[PDB]
Scaffold this active site. Sequence first.
Site, PDB file in Angstrom:
ATOM      1  N   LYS A   1       6.369   2.312  -1.157  1.00  0.00           N
ATOM      2  CA  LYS A   1       6.841   1.669  -2.345  1.00  0.00           C
ATOM      3  C   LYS A   1       8.167   0.868  -2.187  1.00  0.00           C
ATOM      4  CE  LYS A   1       6.518   5.367  -4.953  1.00  0.00           C
ATOM      5  NZ  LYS A   1       6.002   6.644  -5.601  1.00  0.00           N
TER       6      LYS A   1
ATOM      7  N   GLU B   1     -10.573  12.141 -15.518  1.00  0.00           N
ATOM      8  CA  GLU B   1     -10.793  12.803 -16.817  1.00  0.00           C
ATOM      9  C   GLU B   1      -9.490  13.389 -17.347  1.00  0.00           C
ATOM     10  OE1 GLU B   1     -11.826  13.475 -13.583  1.00  0.00           O
ATOM     11  OE2 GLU B   1     -12.885  15.497 -13.960  1.00  0.00           O
TER      12      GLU B   1
ATOM     13  N   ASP C   1       0.708  -1.301   0.000  1.00  0.00           N
ATOM     14  CA  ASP C   1       0.000   0.000   0.000  1.00  0.00           C
ATOM     15  C   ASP C   1       0.739   1.357   0.000  1.00  0.00           C
ATOM     16  OD1 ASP C   1      -2.069   1.953   0.116  1.00  0.00           O
ATOM     17  OD2 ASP C   1      -2.004   1.771   2.290  1.00  0.00           O
TER      18      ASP C   1
ATOM     19  N   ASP D   1      -0.434  -0.719  -4.833  1.00  0.00           N
ATOM     20  CA  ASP D   1      -0.890   0.632  -5.085  1.00  0.00           C
ATOM     21  C   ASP D   1       0.261   1.621  -5.414  1.00  0.00           C
ATOM     22  OD1 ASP D   1      -3.061   2.543  -5.234  1.00  0.00           O
ATOM     23  OD2 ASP D   1      -2.152   3.447  -3.488  1.00  0.00           O
ATOM     24  N   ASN D   2      -0.077   2.643  -6.179  1.00  0.00           N
ATOM     25  CA  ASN D   2       0.859   3.742  -6.438  1.00  0.00           C
ATOM     26  C   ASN D   2       2.185   3.317  -7.103  1.00  0.00           C
ATOM     27  OD1 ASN D   2       1.460   6.466  -6.544  1.00  0.00           O
ATOM     28  ND2 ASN D   2       2.317   6.564  -4.478  1.00  0.00           N
TER      29      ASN D   2
END
Length: 212
Positions: free
Chosen positions: A142, A197, A139, A167-168
């Site tokens: 890293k 977007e 999580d 994640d990430n």
Amino acid sequence: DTKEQRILRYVQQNAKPGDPQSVLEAIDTYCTQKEWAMNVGDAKGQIMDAVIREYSPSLVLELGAYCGYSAVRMARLLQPGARLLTMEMNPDYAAITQQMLNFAGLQDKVTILNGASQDLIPQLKKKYDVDTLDMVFLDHWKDRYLPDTLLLEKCGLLRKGTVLLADNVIVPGTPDFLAYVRGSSSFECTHYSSYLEYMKVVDGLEKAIYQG
């Protein structure tokens, strides 16, 4: 006081206790008001949801936690009898994650382990009932993803079809973890980049399915 504890009183004032959707919306709104670069909540949660729903894990290990968003996110979806174990070294992150799960009414499905991943992973089989894991969520930290992965293998905690979801992982980020699971014939990999977007990745996630 601390920003992780600010997320807490905020949830405490806005969410409905026992309603994890309300807690997630509260955590999301707060962190989006400021900290997340864009809306990382929505960007990660919907991938997390599809993965949990595809594989139906009965035992999930979370490695790393910060303000409990991810743990609430997974735990809300666990089938009856399924459990989440979450490990986090920082005692305040562990505390906030616990408090957030209590608020959401999910504390019965989760065990928070406050300790170093390296001391706790070897203990998993004897001291908790673990044979192999169904899913691993990696999580917040890293630089721990590779060494934790290597240690779960060492310790015989992964079986064929165990899902790791990290994640990430946005490139050039986590060069070593990616290089490992991708170049390895023991992991089949799928990369998810959530733009919302926008033209720039808001969150990127790696699914690595262990092959035995």
